[PDB]
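Assemble and predict.
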Amino acid sequence: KHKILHRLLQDS
Amino acid sequence: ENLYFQGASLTEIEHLVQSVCKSYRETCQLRLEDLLRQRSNIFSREEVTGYQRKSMWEMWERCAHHLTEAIQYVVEFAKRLSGFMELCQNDQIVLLKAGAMEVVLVRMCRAYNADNRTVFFEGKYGGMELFRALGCSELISSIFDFSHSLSALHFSEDEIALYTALVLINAHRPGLQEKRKVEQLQYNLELAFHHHLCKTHRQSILAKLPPKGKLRSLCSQHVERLQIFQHLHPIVVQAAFPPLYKELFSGG
Ligand SMILES: CCS(=O)(=O)c1ccc([C@@H](NC(C)=O)C(=O)Nc2ccc(C(O)(C(F)(F)F)C(F)(F)F)cc2)cc1
Ligand code: NA
């Protein structure tokens, strides 16, 4: 149940 | 939210060309000059054989890792693209899940040498025979043919920048909640691309670009060959495949 996109999208 | 979510003037379209080309230069992963210079660096018969002797699962792992690396650069490109961060999170995820692989396939033509039919992989250039251990020869040859057809267009970096921005901002992606917002953003990016081709006398390539069905077919084939591999080596996928790769191609 991996969800990495939301992390990359939130990382500024 | 964003200027490109409404009808854009010529000066604003000119401003969009510059912006898209800047986002691409900043996130292109490998510089074209470095890829072009490495063309004379080709894997030997002995190195090719070594790759062919690798296990199917070791080869799938290495390839999934190199694809994830490329995808990460496409995520950065998306984040720097005008209007993309102004879309809702659902839509950003929908857009990247459907189009990240398509952008990578398009970007790959820069790393493909039409003269000897080789691709840049792990420091050198090798032909499709390098990937024989994967057991997906139809997919590999379809990717090489696709890269060959793009290479015949002699795409500039700016052309790749504007075309890939368009591949990503596709308002026909199933599951988009702010469809009209994506449609207007798609329309301005189409104008930006077509304006740049008009300005450089490159409109002759419009009819030579692949159909959307071609990139969709390649992505469908990728997903289908990964399902076949997964059935053979489920623990390899579960333990050693990148989490981002699994989020995009095997539903998590
Ligand atoms: C895509 C952006 S760019 O042009 O800057 C750029 C090109 C090539 C590489 C290569 N960097 C390394 C270290 O290897 C690279 O990743 N090459 C590769 C070739 C084929 C593939 C494939 O998975 C396929 F073709 F399917 F995409 C393979 F052929 F193995 F199956 C997977 C990676 C990195 C960046
Ligand atoms: Na090429």
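The CA atoms of residues 6 and 12 of chain A lie 12 Å apart.
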